[PDB]
Design a protein around this ligand. Structure first.
Ligand SMILES: Nc1ncnc2c1ncn2[C@H]1C[C@H](O)[C@@H](COP(=O)(O)OP(=O)(O)OP(=O)(O)O)O1
Ligand SMILES: [Mg+2]
Ligand SMILES: [Mg+2]
Length: 425
DNA sequence: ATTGTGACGCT
DNA sequence: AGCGTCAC
C-alpha cells in the first residue's frame, strides 16, 4: 500500500548510437551515407567479419558476426568500410575518438556512465528538477517531443500512431504536481530530445534513447523504437510490457541465468516472475539475484548511474584461429610486442588526456584446443609505459606454458594485454 | 575461423 | 588473485 516504494525516484536515460561504426565511416565518406553498408574487420577469410550494419542493410538480413562474402549473398550492393589495421591487427582508434566526441557532448547536460564505446547511461533526476521549476506550471507541448514514443499508447502510418500516443499521454498529464513521476519522465524526455539534437548538430551522429526510472528499463525502452527515435517507458507501462516480454531481453538475463530462470520456474515472460515470493527467487538464484529479480519484474531496480565517463581498462586483444595459431617463440614474442606497442601508444595518450597512470598489466592467453575463451590470466606490475618492457614482462609471465623441449606448444589462439588499476597522475 | 573490446561477480 | 558471466 502506502509503504510499498515503487522505484520512481530517479529519471534515467540510456543513449545508444545507431550502428555506430557505420555512422563514423559514413560521416567520413559521404558516398556511404543512406546506403546498405557495413563495417568489416580483416578481408582475407570469407571477405572479413562484419561488425556493424546500417539499417538499410539490416533490411536485407545482414547482421553482425556474418562473413562479408555471405552478407554479399543477401545484399549484393552492400557497401563496406574496413577497420584500420596497425601493427598487424585491427585498431579501433577512430571509433574511440568519435565516442569521446559524443560522450563529451552528453556530459554537458547531465552526468553519464560510459557503458560501452557507443552507449551511456544518463542520470537526469537533478536536470529534470531544474527544468521543472523553470517551467513554473506551463504544459509540455508535443512540439518539444518530436521523436518520442510513449510505450503502450495509443490504446482505447507510423508517425501518425506515434503522435496519437503522445497526445494521449500529454492530455493525461497533471502538470501542476511537480512530484508526479510521469511528469518527471516527460521532462526527462524533453531534455533527451535536446541532448540528441546537440549530438547530431555537433557530430553528425544520430542515436536512439530510452527514458525511464532506472537503467534496465531505460535500456529496454531504447530498443523499442530504433533508429533515431526515443522511447519513454513509464512505471504504469510495465505490467503490459512485461506480460509478453521474453526474459532474455532484460539486461543480464540473456545468458545462462536467464535460461535457468526459464527452466527452473517453467515460465517464459518477465511478468510471470511476479507470482513468486522474494524468498522463492532467492532460493533458486541466490540472495542478490533473487532480490534483484523480485524487484525487477515489478519495474524496480536500484543500480546507480555511476559517474564514469572514461573506461576503467585499456585493452589490446588478438585472436589467432586455425592454422594461424602461434607455434614458435619468435612468433609469440613478435605479437606480444605488437600488442604492447599499441597499448603503449594508447596509454601515453590516455595519461596526457586524463591525468592518470595504469599500475597493473593483465596478460591473458588461449591455447589451441582449449574450449574456454580465456585459458589463463595472470597479472604483473606495470611500472613504465614501455612496449619492449611490457612485452618482455608478459612473456616472462606466460613462458612456463610452453611445454616444448625455440618451439611453442600447445599453439596459442589468443593474446591479450590489458592495463588496469589506474591512479591519478 | 564472430573479433575486439569492456564491466562486473564469485570465491 | 584468477576465473567466470554478460553484452555487445
Ligand atoms: N560483438 C561485437 N564485436 C565488435 N564490435 C562490436 C560488437 N558489438 C558492437 N560492436 C561495435 C560496433 C558497433 O557500431 C558499436 C555499437 O554496438 P551496438 O550498439 O550493439 O550496435 P550498433 O551501434 O552497431 O547498432 P544499433 O543501432 O543496433 O545500436 O560497437
Ligand atoms: Mg548502438
Ligand atoms: Mg550500444
Amino acid at each position: 500500500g502506502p509503504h510499498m516504494a515503487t522505484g520512481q525516484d530517479r529519471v534515467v536515460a540510456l543513449v545508444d548510437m545507431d550502428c555506430f561504426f557505420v555512422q563514423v565511416e559514413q560521416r567520413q565518406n559521404p558516398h556511404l551515407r543512406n546506403k546498405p553498408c557495413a563495417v568489416v574487420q580483416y578481408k582475407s577469410w570469407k571477405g572479413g567479419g562484419i561488425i556493424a550494419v546500417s539499417y538499410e542493410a539490416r533490411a536485407f538480413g545482414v547482421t553482425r558476426s556474418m562473413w562479408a562474402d555471405d552478407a554479399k549473398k543477401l545484399c549484393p550492393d552492400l557497401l563496406l568500410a574496413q577497420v584500420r589495421e596497425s601493427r598487424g591487427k585491427a585498431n579501433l582508434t577512430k571509433y574511440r575518438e568519435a565516442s569521446v566526441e559524443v560522450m563529451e557532448i552528453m556530459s554537458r547536460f547531465a552526468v553519464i556512465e560510459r557503458a560501452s564505446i557507443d552507449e551511456a547511461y544518463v542520470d537526469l533526476t537533478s536536470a529534470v528538477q531544474e527544468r521543472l521549476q523553470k517551467l513554473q506550471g506551463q504544459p509540455i507541448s508535443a512540439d518539444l517531443l518530436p521523436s518520442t514514443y510513449i510505450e503502450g499508447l495509443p490504446q482505447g502510418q507510423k508517425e501518425g500512431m506515434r503522435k496519437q500516443g503522445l497526445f494521449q499521454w500529454l492530455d493525461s498529464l497533471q502538470i501542476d504536481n511537480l512530484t508526479s513521476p510521469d511528469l518527471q519522465l516527460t521532462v526527462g524526455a524533453v531534455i533527451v530530445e535536446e541532448m540528441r539534437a546537440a549530438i547530431e548538430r555537433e557530430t553528425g551522429f544520430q542515436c536512439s534513447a530510452g527514458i525511464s526510472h532506472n537503467k534496465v528499463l531505460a535500456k529496454l525502452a531504447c530498443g523499442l523504437n530504433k533508429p533515431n527515435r526515443q522511447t519513454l517507458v513509464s512505471h504504469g507501462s510495465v505490467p503490459q510490457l512485461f506480460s509478453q516480454m521474453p526474459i532474455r531481453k532484460i539486461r543480464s538475463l540473456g545468458g545462462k541465468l536467464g535460461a535457468s530462470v526459464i527452466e527452473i520456474l517453467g515460465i517464459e515472460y518477465m511478468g510471470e516472475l511476479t507470482q513468486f515470493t522474494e524468498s522463492q527467487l532467492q532460493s533458486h538464484f541466490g540472495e542478490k539475484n533473487g532480490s534483484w529479480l523480485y524487484a525487477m519484474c515489478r519495474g524496480i531496480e536500484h543500480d546507480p548511474v555511476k559517474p564514469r565517463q572514461l573506461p576503467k581498462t585499456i585493452g589490446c586483444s588478438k585472436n589467432f584461429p586455425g592454422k594461424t595459431a602461434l607455434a614458435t617463440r619468435e612468433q609469440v614474442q613478435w605479437w606480444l610486442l605488437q600488442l604492447a606497442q599499441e597499448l603503449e601508444e594508447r596509454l601515453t595518450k590516455d595519461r596526457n588526456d586524463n591525468d592518470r597512470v595504469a599500475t597493473q598489466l593483465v596478460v591473458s592467453i588461449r591455447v589451441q584446443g582449449d574450449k574456454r575463451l580465456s585459458s589463463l590470466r595472470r597479472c604483473c606490475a606495470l611500472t613504465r609505459y614501455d612496449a619492449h618492457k611490457m612485452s618482455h614482462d608478459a612473456f616472462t609471465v606466460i613462458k612456463n606454458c610452453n611445454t616444448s623441449g625455440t618451439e611453442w606448444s600447445p599453439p596459442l589462439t589468443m593474446l591479450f594485454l590489458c592495463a588496469t588499476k589506474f591512479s591519478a597522475s
